Amino acid sequence: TILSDVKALGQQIWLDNLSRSLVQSGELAQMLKQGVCGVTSNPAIFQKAFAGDALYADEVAALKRQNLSPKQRYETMAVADVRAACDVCLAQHESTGGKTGFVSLEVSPELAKDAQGTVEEARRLHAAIARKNAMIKVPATDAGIDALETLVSDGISVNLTLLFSRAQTLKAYAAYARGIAKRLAAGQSVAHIQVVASFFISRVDSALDATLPDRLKGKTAIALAKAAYQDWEQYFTAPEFAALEAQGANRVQLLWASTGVKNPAYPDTLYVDSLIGVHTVNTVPDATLKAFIDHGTAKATLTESADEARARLAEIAALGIDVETLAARLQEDGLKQFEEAFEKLLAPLV
Amino acid sequence: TILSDVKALGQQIWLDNLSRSLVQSGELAQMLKQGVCGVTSNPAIFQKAFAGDALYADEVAALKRQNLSPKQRYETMAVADVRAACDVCLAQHESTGGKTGFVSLEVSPELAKDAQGTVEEARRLHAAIARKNAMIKVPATDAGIDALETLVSDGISVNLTLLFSRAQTLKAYAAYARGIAKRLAAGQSVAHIQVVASFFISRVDSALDATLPDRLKGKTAIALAKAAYQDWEQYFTAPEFAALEAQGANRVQLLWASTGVKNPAYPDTLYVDSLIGVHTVNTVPDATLKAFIDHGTAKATLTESADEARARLAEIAALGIDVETLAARLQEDGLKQFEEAFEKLLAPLV
Ligand code: NA
């Protein structure tokens, strides 16, 4: 029931995992009935699935007999899994006018600084999946925000990932709005275009907690998220976006990612309990989902005590910690980590 | 393009007329391609259509051979017209995710002080029309506001008419919110429930201008509308509504009606030019639509000089003119005019 209580506060909970058995077994479908509202993947999720899930072995053996690149073998397998998960989520998606029930597939991390290559791959994967409720996942580098505007103008739903920066998030909103405005100028639909901005949580605390004083440990990532949500409210309520929304456009939604707790000193539901607010998403790994169902709390926390969050961020700046510099480092490290997972994903498909 | 320019400022323009020939000739469909976004009717509009449009005679003759009351004969014909206009407007409605392309049919004016009778008739007409983009039009008397809550809780979109009063409009918002809260408590959908608040313009100036000083002639109706829009922003951004919006509820939206200019000294586009703002509708008679397309101005005027609207209303009150008393009188006169029109419509259907 708690997932329903969180929907009543305006937040969707998505599952931050995907595998062939999760879908085929009916587990994912049961999750949609319990209140899960979507699925996210990334190269690490697929690396783990392909290595651990017995249902891939027959396809791998068959694909190794064809003149296909390792990447092509991976894509064949992953596109099938995403199409199958989309089909499980389609009734939910259609029941809300296309607002929920999405599955995300990320483009190759090799493309992260290549806008045109990102666009081409995203268009190809979008056409290969051929489902209305698939999102293409793109890292929010500067090239990614370039590609976002193009993809939105092409009518493709996007999950912008590896956001750690309030400034880079806001730049993504502007690129979104440019794409929507283009579509309205060309007489094209916008009501079915959905974008989420995946803003990473635990990695900020993992980076800073050792250096912070006791009173600030475990607070920065949440405070940064609360400030990002304030930025979101300001941007999307202002007159230019209000006019687009009145015509049928949807706002980008913040999506809290990296919400599994890594520090055992903190409650395992800390990063779900603390970030609940209106027109947001939280994507959770399976163990965190279980923990939240078991002993999480559904309260409107994201907009609570926002002044105290801003005070903490000022205190962090005064300690000489520049969260925008930190964000650039975390994004570059996350891209390296996804590229390493993608290479590890491809090696057994040779 | 002007209608398109107004859309870009967040306002839809509807046609304040309906007739069988308007639909069957293809005129309505061609208006939609110009940028018209919906249709409103009322008993006076229907009385004029039935008296003037040659396309009704054959259905009148056939229905006179059936065992039906005059009112049932009228309803059969009006429901057919509304269904046909809803079908013309449906692609537009769907294109925006359900935010545009509405057609309104008003209940009998004899029911205006009878909440339960209004509910029963609105339910019956809603079921007979059987279109997702139909609105049932109900006068905003106290009984109509009672009925509004019930109809909203029944999932029925409502155009609440004959509003001349800021206080009565706020009462309507509160009734809407109670109905939405009922839906959400029952697990029912809210995203499809659309309500507009038809706030009359020209009749206020027609009532007051002869006795106002030169400096206030032709200013009251616009000032009321601007202040009403400020009230709307306050009500729908307050925490109580925000908690319903979080779960998919639409705001009510203001709809400017009686926007044809009746005084020849004023510009014929005065009440369209002056009232353009985000997340509103303006329903215009055909001659005013033509004038607006030809020589209107698309500028965000509704939220311009809001403090001057506040000053003008204070000056009007201090002349001893009570605009709330005026509104009640205008509502009662408007009901009487509609009753006379409806009685005249039914007499030839015996
Ligand atoms: Na205001």
Residue numbers in the entry:
A (entry chain A), B (entry chain B): 2 to 351
The authors write:
In the redox-sensitive enzyme transaldolase from Neisseria gonorrhoeae, the side chains of neighboring residues Lys 8 and Cys 38 at the protein surface form an NOS cross-link under oxidizing conditions that leads to a loss of enzymatic activity through ‘structural crosstalk’ with the active site. Under reducing conditions, the cross-link is disengaged, and enzymatic activity is restored. In the previously reported redox-sensitive transaldolase, the NOS bridge functions as an allosteric switch that changes the structure of the protein, including that of the active site, and thereby regulates enzymatic activity. We have recently reported the discovery of an allosteric lysine–cysteine redox switch with a covalent NOS bridge that regulates the enzymatic activity in response to changing redox conditions.
In our initial discovery of the allosteric NOS redox switch in the enzyme transaldolase from N. gonorrhoeae, we had speculated that a neighboring glutamate (Glu 93) might be catalytically essential for formation of the NOS bridge, akin to the suggested role of a glutamate in isopeptide bond formation in some proteins. However, in many proteins with identified NOS or SONOS bridges, no amino acid capable of acid–base catalysis is found in the immediate vicinity of the redox switch, highlighting an intrinsic reactivity of structurally proximal lysine and cysteine residues, provided that ROS and/or oxygen is present. To test this hypothesis, we generated a transaldolase Glu93Gln variant in which a potential catalytic role of residue 93 is eliminated and analyzed the structure and enzymatic properties of the variant. The kinetic constants are very similar to the wild-type enzyme except for a slight 1.5-fold increase in the substrate Michaelis constant, and the variant remains redox activatable. Structural analysis of the Glu93Gln variant by X-ray crystallography clearly indicates formation of the NOS bridge, arguing against a compulsory catalytic mode involving a neighboring amino acid. The NOS cross-link is the only modification observable under non-reducing conditions, akin to our findings for the wild-type enzyme, strongly suggesting that this switch controls the enzymatic activity. While amino acid or enzyme catalysts are not compulsory for NOS bridge formation in vitro, they could impact the kinetics of the reaction.
